[PDB]
Design a protein around this ligand. Structure first.
Ligand SMILES: O=c1ccn([C@@H]2O[C@H](COP(=O)(O)OP(=O)(O)O[C@H]3O[C@H](CO)[C@H](O)[C@H](O)[C@H]3O)[C@@H](O)[C@H]2O)c(=O)[nH]1
Ligand SMILES: O=c1ccn([C@@H]2O[C@H](COP(=O)(O)OP(=O)(O)O[C@H]3O[C@H](CO)[C@H](O)[C@H](O)[C@H]3O)[C@@H](O)[C@H]2O)c(=O)[nH]1
Ligand SMILES: O=c1ccn([C@@H]2O[C@H](COP(=O)(O)OP(=O)(O)O[C@H]3O[C@H](CO)[C@H](O)[C@H](O)[C@H]3O)[C@@H](O)[C@H]2O)c(=O)[nH]1
Ligand SMILES: O=P(O)(O)OC[C@H]1O[C@H](O)[C@H](O)[C@@H](O)[C@@H]1O
Lengths: 630, 206, 309
């Protein structure tokens, strides 16, 4: 009947032409590698976001062999369904199909009824979202039936991302539509919710899936997720920890991992990333001089820049541990008489009323000094020059000046001293631990934690705290860096997460040659602890803290252990470690992580047409995993 | 006057509709004796001067300063922040012009070869690229003011703002630095000084 | 390399028709022994390379430097004067762009007011005025060079130009730096120095700036010239009749050593006209390289400097 060597690919998700969540950036960055393989056989599918879609998005429209897609679009038009076709305006220029859910809501009560009998899934219609998930899932299976019918050359693959898109999976299964399906769940429903309180990873083997889903009141969603995972020919998550998570909580072992790559921007010279680091490290140094203006007793040359960044989830992202650990490291560093310093940044958006006066004013005063210096040094220039050229005449015995009073005059000394005094800060004032005015300061979790461990940037502290409750941006008038530029200039990312199905934070970080500390319960940490032996991975800039088989306090002590380790390094050692980390980035590029998306697609065609694939290859290879196959 | 112009460019960031080459700077200064020093007359006279200049269709602008120290909690964020956002533009512009320089110099030293028919470039696109434009636009957006916010009439946070004579008098005559007003008001409730982060001039220089 | 680029722009003022981003810098250096050091072979090889590139239709450009001290009466006025004329332009451009800044800046901060409907200037006339355009054109004019004049092959006034071997060899192979030549030729009969007013680099600095050393010696007991080159991550071409060449031939398999920046020409077991073609093979290979490749090779050549410690 069909060809497996030349097949179609239909990727379907909620977040196609709209940045609602993380899944956006996966599909987006992946589009170049998937267009380059399929060209016009690849097509992305999702709901038409009337608001923001205006931003991102005939017999000529298709080729002769891809006419069956054109004919099926007109068959959706022949029942009135409005749909936006086009190109998505991002690297690769993949072709999108955006269905209008407003122009199919007249089927809603029928279709919600159909789900009562075909699978058995309740639909409380006071849930605004599951309604749209069902409208899409039926509209897409109303389309995938017609294309499977109107195309009888290619095989057809239909990939679905997250539970909201995958109402179409039970409908492809029950109705026996002639497509092979892949479902990929980036996070389980129960997983996010159970992690609210806190011990998830030990006591999820024994949890009542229906009583728990029923108690949170999200049983109707759980059903759609569970249905999707079972229905599909292939079931997948984005990480091993999520595969473990998905096995018990969704009741199906996955057929493999589809870890999220990145569209890795490369340089012509490898060592370019390294020059950037030092450039952007200088912009942070500029900031840090402004911040500590008046209390500046350390050497920025012998200073390191740790940071945590992301959504403000105090527990899950691990700000709790980070701060506790940084306090303990401060003790170690003081005890061990270390001469190094650590400035730790926390970049997590919280409700604020912009910057403090003290922040802006301080870096304005430091710029005034910068410039008065620059005036004075040109005067010195003029005097060095005039001694130089006049030598050996007019009594000048030495080739160059020897007394400073020859070059630096009263006038010059006064204005420098005035600038110095302007930096002087009140008796006993310290550097702040926040750059902004918080709306609700007394109740901010980060600022409570910092006050409690008493990191207040006193000069004896070797670890300094800076909470910057706002995503980084170039326009920022105190730290004028886009997030990427800031990362590069830093020395060590620290993302000790608890619930984190993937975590792009540490992956991005690794791409730009910066060591991270993640955890074995993060999806990115699982995936690296599999690929690399855990003590060796430290040399490649991947420090993985055990938050699964360790007490919370031992986890903390491991996180301290790793920082202390990193602080101790010399500059050569940091530079190379950085080089090793940058070499690692290819493992996270879609030029490798996009091979795992093909493995899922090769397993979908193996189970779907077992006789046709056997004959097109040779014998029949093992059926159970993606890894067990050709 | 250039240091003043610099201060003003910050102050009116987002709402900068006039020509500093055709702008004049009046000031009053001293101990805050509203009545004896004649701040009352000054503000009133300026309010009227505004009406006269609007009626006559003049294109000049008067930026009027009050330098009388009153109790305050230093500068406003909005003062410091826009003076920073204007430097940010100054700098991004300087970077961009460095790039333009390279592009001009290449054309100049490569003429008349490689099909360079004119001695200098002509199309702006030969000099100014997407990466350059994108920066400049972002720095410009940073200067944008909110829906209908006007430039302030005061550089500081006042202790007792609602009872301040000078400020009540400006509010009363309604000089709020809206664009049509050819008289602007800036009350700076602090003696001038070179260390001042928003108007770094000793008094004598100002 | 930038500091060498500034010199070359000077040197080629007027007749400048290639892209320094797709230009390579070969050099030979040291005590002026025409025959022993390999300058005969070098200049010939280069003339043959010039043919090969024109034939193969290569977009590349080679600027070949010869640093061999010879009897001279200091610099030509034309090298020295052109340097000044190129800086005159550098400083006029710097002034114009300042004016351009002030205009761009004014537009940015004024937008969207005063009839400014776009966020940036769009038409070049808003930024670049006639007074600006005049000073620039005058600076360009001063770089024009006479009817059919070409860039010199020498940076100095020779004492005995008509009999100098290097100069006569170049004239004989007919490399006069015309725009159609893909190989240029700049004989600098003086040891490089930082105080040199045309090319203000000490010898070691120049070495780093170049892309390939070429020291195809006939007699050479050791040869520090390629050894120094190799210490600075600069690929060198040498010969098996040189001491250094023989040593690196022992330590590395001769086809490996090309990937490690040590090209070795055979002048013992080959005809002189086969030697020259092998030297031309090696140069035409290096010109074919991409920047990816040159950089990587440079790192290999660098890592090799431990063996010479
Ligand atoms: O100053 C900053 C700091 C961070 N970032 C960006 O913000 C992201 C941080 O993401 P989050 O920490 O908010 O969370 P993730 O993107 O890791 O994942 C999110 O989406 C996932 C799937 O949609 C899961 O639901 C997960 O729980 C949710 O936090 C990074 O990619 C980073 O590029 C900035 O742009 N500027
Ligand atoms: O930013 C500023 C602004 C003003 N000044 C200085 O402040 C003075 C302003 O004078 P005042 O407003 O303090 O009032 P006068 O000194 O003119 O007069 C006062 O002092 C007199 C003599 O003591 C009389 O007693 C009089 O009654 C009383 O008003 C000027 O000399 C000026 O140099 C600054 O140093 N910085
Ligand atoms: O502009 C320059 C160029 C080169 N050099 C330096 O001067 C040296 C010149 O090298 P030579 O041409 O003198 O050749 P070598 O020193 O490599 O070898 C020479 O010295 C040996 C020991 O005396 C033998 O006599 C041998 O015959 C002879 O070739 C270079 O290595 C370099 O270090 C400069 O100072 N300025
Ligand atoms: O890792 P750091 O201590 O910030 O130093 C790192 C180094 O970064 C780059 O490699 C730069 O080229 C060097 O100038 C700097 O020495």
């Amino acid at each position: 009947s069909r060809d497996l060597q030349n097949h179609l690919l239909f990727e379907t998700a909620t977040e196609v032409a709209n940045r609602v969540g993380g899944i956006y950036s996966v599909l987006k960055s992946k589009a170049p590698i998937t267009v380059a393989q399929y060209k016009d056989h690849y097509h992305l599918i999702g709901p038409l976001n009337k608001a923001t879609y205006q931003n991102e998005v005939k017999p000529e429209a298709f080729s002769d062999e891809m006419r069956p897609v054109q004919h099926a679009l007109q068959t959706m038009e022949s029942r009135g369904v409005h749909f936006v076709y086009g190109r998505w305006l991002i690297e690769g220029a993949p072709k999108v199909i955006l269905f209008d859910l407003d122009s199919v809501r007249g089927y809603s009560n029928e279709w919600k009824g159909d789900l009562w009998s075909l699978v058995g899934i309740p639909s409380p219609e006071n849930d605004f979202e599951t309604n749209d998930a069902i409208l899409l899932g039926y509209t897409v299976a109303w389309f995938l039936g017609e294309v499977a019918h109107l195309d009888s050359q290619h095989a057809i693959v239909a990939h679905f991302h997250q539970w909201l898109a995958g109402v179409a999976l039970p409908l492809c299964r029950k109705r026996r539509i002639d497509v092979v399906t892949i479902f990929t769940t980036h996070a389980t429903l129960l997983g996010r919710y159970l992690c609210a309180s806190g011990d998830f990873y030990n006591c999820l083997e024994s949890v009542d899936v229906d009583h728990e889903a029923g108690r949170f009141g999200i049983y109707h969603r759980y059903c759609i997720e569970r249905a999707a995972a079972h229905s599909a020919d292939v079931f997948t998550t984005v990480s091993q920890i999520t595969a473990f998570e998905a096995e018990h909580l969704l009741k199906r072992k996955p057929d493999g991992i589809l870890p999220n790559g990145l569209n890795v921007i490369k340089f012509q010279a490898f060592h370019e990333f390294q020059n950037l680091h030092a450039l952007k490290k200088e912009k942070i140094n500029d900031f840090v001089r402004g911040h500590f203006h008046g209390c500046f007793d350390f050497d920025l040359d012998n200073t390191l820049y740790f940071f945590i960044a992301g959504r403000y989830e105090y527990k899950n992202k691990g700000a709790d541990m980070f701060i506790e650990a940084l306090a303990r490291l401060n003790y170690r560093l003081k005890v061990s008489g270390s001469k190094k310093t650590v400035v730790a940044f926390i970049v997590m958006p919280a409700k604020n009323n912009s910057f403090t006066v003290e922040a802006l004013k301080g870096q304005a005063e430091v710029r005034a000094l910068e410039n008065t210096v620059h005036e004075v040094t040109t005067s010195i220039g003029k005097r060095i020059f005039d001694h130089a050229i006049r030598y050996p005449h007019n009594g000048l015995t030495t080739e160059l000046p020897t007394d400073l009073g020859e070059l630096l005059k009263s006038s010059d000394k006064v204005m420098l001293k005035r600038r110095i005094l302007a930096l002087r800060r009140p008796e006993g004032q310290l550097p702040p631990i926040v750059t902004h005015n918080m709306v609700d300061d007394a109740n901010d979790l980060i600022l409570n934690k910092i006050r409690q461990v008493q990191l207040f940037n006193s000069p004896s502290d070797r670890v300094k705290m800076i909470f910057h409750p706002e995503f980084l941006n170039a326009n920022n008038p105190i730290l004028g860096l886009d997030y990427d530029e800031f990362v590069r200039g830093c020395h060590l990312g620290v993302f000790p997460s608890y619930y984190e199905p993937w975590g792009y934070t540490p992956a991005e970080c690794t791409v730009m040659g910066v060591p991270s500390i993640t955890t074995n319960v993060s999806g990115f940490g699982s995936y690296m602890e599999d690929l690399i032996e855990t003590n060796q991975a430290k040399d490649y800039g991947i420090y993985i803290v055990d938050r699964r088989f360790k007490a919370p306090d031992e986890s903390v002590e491991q996180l301290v252990d790793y920082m202390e380790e990193f602080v101790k390094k010399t500059r050569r050692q940091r530079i190379n470690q950085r080089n090793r980390t940058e070499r690692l980035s290819d493992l996270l590029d879609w030029k490798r992580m996009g091979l795992e998306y093909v493995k899922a697609r090769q397993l979908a065609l193996r189970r779907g047409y077992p006789d046709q694939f056997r004959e097109l290859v040779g014998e029949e290879l093992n059926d159970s995993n993606m890894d067990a196959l050709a």
